[PDB]
Design an enzyme around this catalytic site. Structure first.
Site, PDB file in Angstrom:
ATOM      1  N   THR A 156     -28.197 -72.460  83.448  1.00  0.00           N
ATOM      2  CA  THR A 156     -27.079 -72.181  84.347  1.00  0.00           C
ATOM      3  C   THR A 156     -27.146 -73.028  85.596  1.00  0.00           C
ATOM      4  O   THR A 156     -28.233 -73.387  86.039  1.00  0.00           O
ATOM      5  CB  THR A 156     -27.112 -70.660  84.725  1.00  0.00           C
ATOM      6  OG1 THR A 156     -26.914 -69.902  83.536  1.00  0.00           O
ATOM      7  CG2 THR A 156     -25.975 -70.254  85.609  1.00  0.00           C
ATOM      8  N   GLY A 157     -25.975 -73.388  86.119  1.00  0.00           N
ATOM      9  CA  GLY A 157     -25.863 -74.151  87.352  1.00  0.00           C
ATOM     10  C   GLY A 157     -25.393 -75.581  87.113  1.00  0.00           C
ATOM     11  O   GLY A 157     -25.317 -76.044  85.964  1.00  0.00           O
ATOM     12  N   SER A 158     -25.116 -76.275  88.214  1.00  0.00           N
ATOM     13  CA  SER A 158     -24.615 -77.652  88.199  1.00  0.00           C
ATOM     14  C   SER A 158     -25.586 -78.698  87.648  1.00  0.00           C
ATOM     15  O   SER A 158     -25.148 -79.622  87.002  1.00  0.00           O
ATOM     16  CB  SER A 158     -24.190 -78.060  89.637  1.00  0.00           C
ATOM     17  OG  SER A 158     -25.310 -78.114  90.522  1.00  0.00           O
ATOM     18  N   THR A 159     -26.884 -78.611  87.901  1.00  0.00           N
ATOM     19  CA  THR A 159     -27.767 -79.657  87.384  1.00  0.00           C
ATOM     20  C   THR A 159     -27.734 -79.616  85.859  1.00  0.00           C
ATOM     21  O   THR A 159     -27.580 -80.634  85.176  1.00  0.00           O
ATOM     22  CB  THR A 159     -29.200 -79.482  87.846  1.00  0.00           C
ATOM     23  OG1 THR A 159     -29.233 -79.374  89.270  1.00  0.00           O
ATOM     24  CG2 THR A 159     -30.010 -80.739  87.563  1.00  0.00           C
ATOM     25  N   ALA A 167     -33.431 -74.712  88.883  1.00  0.00           N
ATOM     26  CA  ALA A 167     -34.226 -73.867  89.749  1.00  0.00           C
ATOM     27  C   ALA A 167     -33.785 -74.072  91.190  1.00  0.00           C
ATOM     28  O   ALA A 167     -33.235 -75.118  91.539  1.00  0.00           O
ATOM     29  CB  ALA A 167     -35.688 -74.229  89.629  1.00  0.00           C
ATOM     30  N   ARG A 203     -29.973 -68.052  92.254  1.00  0.00           N
ATOM     31  CA  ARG A 203     -28.820 -68.342  93.109  1.00  0.00           C
ATOM     32  C   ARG A 203     -27.576 -68.039  92.277  1.00  0.00           C
ATOM     33  O   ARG A 203     -26.645 -67.369  92.732  1.00  0.00           O
ATOM     34  CB  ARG A 203     -28.816 -69.816  93.521  1.00  0.00           C
ATOM     35  CG  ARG A 203     -27.622 -70.291  94.417  1.00  0.00           C
ATOM     36  CD  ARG A 203     -27.692 -71.812  94.634  1.00  0.00           C
ATOM     37  NE  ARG A 203     -26.612 -72.432  95.415  1.00  0.00           N
ATOM     38  CZ  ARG A 203     -26.676 -72.670  96.742  1.00  0.00           C
ATOM     39  NH1 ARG A 203     -27.745 -72.314  97.455  1.00  0.00           N
ATOM     40  NH2 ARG A 203     -25.663 -73.258  97.366  1.00  0.00           N
ATOM     41  N   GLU A 213     -31.543 -65.711  81.729  1.00  0.00           N
ATOM     42  CA  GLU A 213     -32.358 -66.912  81.820  1.00  0.00           C
ATOM     43  C   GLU A 213     -33.790 -66.628  81.436  1.00  0.00           C
ATOM     44  O   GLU A 213     -34.326 -67.328  80.591  1.00  0.00           O
ATOM     45  CB  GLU A 213     -32.316 -67.525  83.221  1.00  0.00           C
ATOM     46  CG  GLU A 213     -31.005 -68.221  83.495  1.00  0.00           C
ATOM     47  CD  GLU A 213     -30.843 -68.532  84.962  1.00  0.00           C
ATOM     48  OE1 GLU A 213     -31.378 -67.782  85.824  1.00  0.00           O
ATOM     49  OE2 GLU A 213     -30.258 -69.580  85.229  1.00  0.00           O
ATOM     50  N   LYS A 251     -35.335 -79.389  95.796  1.00  0.00           N
ATOM     51  CA  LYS A 251     -35.947 -78.176  95.241  1.00  0.00           C
ATOM     52  C   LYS A 251     -37.470 -78.057  95.351  1.00  0.00           C
ATOM     53  O   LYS A 251     -38.013 -76.958  95.343  1.00  0.00           O
ATOM     54  CB  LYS A 251     -35.546 -78.038  93.774  1.00  0.00           C
ATOM     55  CG  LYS A 251     -34.166 -77.427  93.560  1.00  0.00           C
ATOM     56  CD  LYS A 251     -33.013 -78.309  94.010  1.00  0.00           C
ATOM     57  CE  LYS A 251     -31.707 -77.525  93.997  1.00  0.00           C
ATOM     58  NZ  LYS A 251     -31.204 -77.335  92.589  1.00  0.00           N
TER      59      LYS A 251
HETATM   60  O1  LIG Z   1     -31.279 -70.122  88.778  1.00  0.00           O
HETATM   61  C1  LIG Z   1     -30.105 -70.479  88.793  1.00  0.00           C
HETATM   62  O2  LIG Z   1     -29.209 -69.645  88.938  1.00  0.00           O
HETATM   63  C2  LIG Z   1     -29.750 -71.948  88.648  1.00  0.00           C
HETATM   64  O3  LIG Z   1     -30.441 -72.586  87.570  1.00  0.00           O
HETATM   65  C3  LIG Z   1     -30.043 -72.589  90.012  1.00  0.00           C
HETATM   66  O4  LIG Z   1     -31.323 -72.188  90.448  1.00  0.00           O
HETATM   67  C4  LIG Z   1     -29.958 -74.109  90.041  1.00  0.00           C
HETATM   68  O5  LIG Z   1     -28.587 -74.457  90.261  1.00  0.00           O
HETATM   69  P1  LIG Z   1     -28.206 -75.993  90.544  1.00  0.00           P
HETATM   70  O6  LIG Z   1     -28.801 -76.839  89.479  1.00  0.00           O
HETATM   71  O7  LIG Z   1     -26.723 -76.112  90.752  1.00  0.00           O
HETATM   72  O8  LIG Z   1     -28.783 -76.137  91.944  1.00  0.00           O
HETATM   73 CL   LIG Z   2     -29.043 -67.857  88.044  1.00  0.00          CL
END
Ligand SMILES: O=C(O)[C@H](O)[C@@H](O)COP(=O)(O)O
Ligand SMILES: [Cl-]
Ligand SMILES: O=C(O)[C@H](O)[C@@H](O)COP(=O)(O)O
Ligand SMILES: O=C(O)[C@H](O)[C@@H](O)COP(=O)(O)O
Ligand SMILES: O=C(O)[C@H](O)[C@@H](O)COP(=O)(O)O
Ligand SMILES: [Cl-]
Ligand SMILES: [Cl-]
Ligand SMILES: [Cl-]
Ligand SMILES: [Cl-]
Ligand SMILES: [Cl-]
Ligand SMILES: [Cl-]
Ligand SMILES: [Cl-]
Ligand SMILES: [Cl-]
Ligand code: NA
Ligand code: NA
Lengths: 229, 229, 229, 229
Positions: free
Chosen positions: C28-31, C87, C100, C107, C125
């Site tokens: 999950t998330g943008s990366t 992360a 976040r 996860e 990070k």
């Molecule tokens: O844990 C999460 O929710 C996501 O993986 C987050 O930690 C990382 O989000 P990003 O890649 O947009 O910063």
């Molecule tokens: Cl998350």
């Protein structure tokens, strides 16, 4: 000829409607369970190919997995070609009551979008009028349960909160809701009663399935029967 | 005295621990139901007053509402004076197995913060050791059910997904989860097992209630017994 | 040489660890979104095949579907070969803080079972210790939130209930729970804390992912670097 | 008069409809929050007594608790005397759009049962027709989301899945559902559309609140103004 036999033949006849490359809504309960098994067998044999199932419940999903039927959620597919499910009652105009299994919400969501909705049941499910034999399951937001019951007294429905056996307290549906079983003495306008119940704040879905079944396949003590409309 | 008579006597005895102006954790299941009903009658009669119950399940909440006991959720109260609940098993050090009713998550949230946790059981619930007669119920995030079953088995437990009777598919808990019944051999260190089990991702709560019960009120074949920490 | 470029190169590197016939946990998330898009494009080209993604959130699922990657829930697969995710923090020992995005429950469920858990991050990070830059998200049962926030006092954590922006009231997770974000001074033993937090009745999951990451790919201004334990 | 004071006035006025021994629906949002605070102040000072609030959201419940207003869920009370809540739009026939706060389901459940439903807004919320400036929020069963957007777009509604800011992925409602915001050019027939939207399987509730408001208290540059039909 034994109920279970009447269910299996209904389920065998249903296969005649399933062709390659279809997305199939997979229903809930003992009659449909037969169909799911028969379907997976035909897949393994190679006699059908490129089928994807969209389960109407965790029971359906699990059975589909066990029989190696590929599955997907509604939002993964572009259309539901055929949906196969059971019913607790089937009236002459092919209005149904569903929900004994408590999966009515996902069932209607999927069966509503199906090109053809096939209903499988044995003889016992045929009725002269809706509510001749069974109550109407109504899935409700938990805190609205009592008010809804009391509000259904206008239709002389004897409504009761369904209670768990393998848990204490009310049965919880797959979506976290309660389920009220409303025994109407009769329902003279199933379609509009379906709408009426859904316009009540707190009512998630109700087990009246009107203007939706396309074919009903019935398993009789003497072969198979079918109802169309 | 039969079993129900035994449950009743334990419930009556517990009332002696309830005083005016108490916030009472209200437990789940048959034995505690007697307690809630009697508490309600005392309140109606004016024998006790200014009490607030904090229900551990929809079952307890609904039973309280029906018996006119004021309730409140945990976040509404300053504290929990006494929590009263049942158990599936009670070992010699007063460690318990709970969860038959499938309400272990709220039971533990409430009983964990109670000034005194009082357990109500009939004679049959006493065991030489935890898991002599009953499995440990484990509440799990639905999609982790299979992995967790597989992992527990490697740990020498026979585990199975609890299935619905008044619904098809799995039992759903009040929080929308699945529940697994895991029969371990015999648990010599309930507290460490309780803590480490919860460390598994997907395990939300387990039925081992160790180091938390303060008094166990036991209904016996001819009378009443009170065990204490 | 900005953040998004840093994220993309980490995603590109990760794709190197993916082979035909793999079940992949989709973070999950943008990366990770970059990774999912690249995985889809490579699958479009035909350069890898026979992959199935197991999404850790609706976000990951939705993106997978949009990029035509076959998907499944955890209970449909035999194992997770590799899981890829981001992360919020990565310490020197490669313990993480995550959440976040509020998808921490799913996860951890999927990542705990991965043959190889690959973490993708830009250089922001990296931390010298956990909680140097970010708080630990803690998913909690709604009615337990106030008690838990109070009980966190002993850790000297400043804890706040995470509030909705596109809804009023608290953020609701995909499983119907609240999140408390807790900024501890600095975590000595991530693993012990991770365990201690979960032992609290009402705490469902926490964002400390200790002793689980296998590889951390880091996009920096100097180009990609890899960290292993 | 600045924004809030429009809100504060309306709320101030609303308190005049509140009497001793009433059960009051406590609405969601900034405008109603002033009402809940004022009510809490009036009860603290003894000016009103023996009131019970029935909150329409976690936001309302937590604000009520902070202000020592006793509360209950709908099934705990015999009736809702008065319900007080805000709105995103008000048309001339006193039909509203609500749901920006994502609490439309419980809002309608409570307000539908109110003896008198009182709506609180400032000047801006008045409109010539519904949807002149706001979309209709629609709460949906998650797996039906895409189909619903497709079905709605067949009626000139531009519809989007509402997305989280303080979580990744979709906004989740208090009942674990998604929200779709649908902007029609206009809704000439609010009640008809309100019903139609609710008859779609997968739609749980919509933000059109037609023929339910009894009184709209508008904070007005001037001072104040009570509308009713
Ligand atoms: O844990 C999460 O929710 C996501 O993986 C987050 O930690 C990382 O989000 P990003 O890649 O947009 O910063
Ligand atoms: Cl998350
Ligand atoms: O609606 C349901 O829950 C079932 O399909 C029910 O209508 C019939 O289940 P059965 O095939 O076991 O009778
Ligand atoms: O934990 C539970 O679910 C119950 O308290 C159970 O342990 C006891 O149920 P009983 O009192 O009906 O036997
Ligand atoms: O419908 C809602 O969720 C609220 O009442 C909202 O729409 C009105 O909020 P406001 O009073 O903060 O503008
Ligand atoms: Cl069903
Ligand atoms: Cl319950
Ligand atoms: Cl239980
Ligand atoms: Cl059951
Ligand atoms: Cl199910
Ligand atoms: Cl948000
Ligand atoms: Cl809320
Ligand atoms: Cl999500
Ligand atoms: Na729900
Ligand atoms: Na949940």
């Amino acid at each position: 000829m034994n109920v279970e036999e009447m269910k299996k033949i209904a389920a065998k006849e249903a296969l005649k409607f399933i062709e390659d490359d279809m997305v199939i809504g997979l229903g809930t309960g003992s009659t449909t369970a037969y169909f799911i098994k028969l379907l997976g067998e035909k897949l393994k044999r190679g006699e059908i190919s490129d089928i994807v199932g969209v389960p109407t419940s965790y029971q359906a999903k699990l059975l589909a997995i066990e029989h190696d039927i590929p599955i997907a959620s509604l939002d993964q597919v572009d259309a539901i070609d055929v949906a196969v499910d059971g019913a607790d009652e089937v009236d002459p105009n092919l209005n149904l009551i569903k929900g004994r299994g408590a999966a009515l919400t996902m069932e209607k969501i999927i069966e509503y979008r199906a090109g053809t909705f096939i209903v499988l049941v044995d003889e016992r499910k045929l009725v002269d009028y809706l509510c001749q034999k069974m109550p109407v399951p109504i899935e409700v937001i938990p805190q609205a349960w009592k008010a809804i019951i009391e509000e259904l007294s206008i239709f002389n429905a004897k409504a009761e909160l369904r209670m768990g056996v393998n848990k204490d307290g009310p049965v919880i549906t797959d979506n976290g809701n309660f389920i009220i079983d409303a025994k109407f003495p009769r329902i003279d306008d199933p379609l509009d009663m379906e709408i009426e119940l859904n316009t009540i704040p707190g009512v998630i879905e109700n087990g009246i399935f009107a203007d939706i079944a396309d074919i009903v396949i019935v398993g009789t003590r003497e072969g198979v029967k079918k109802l169309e409309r």
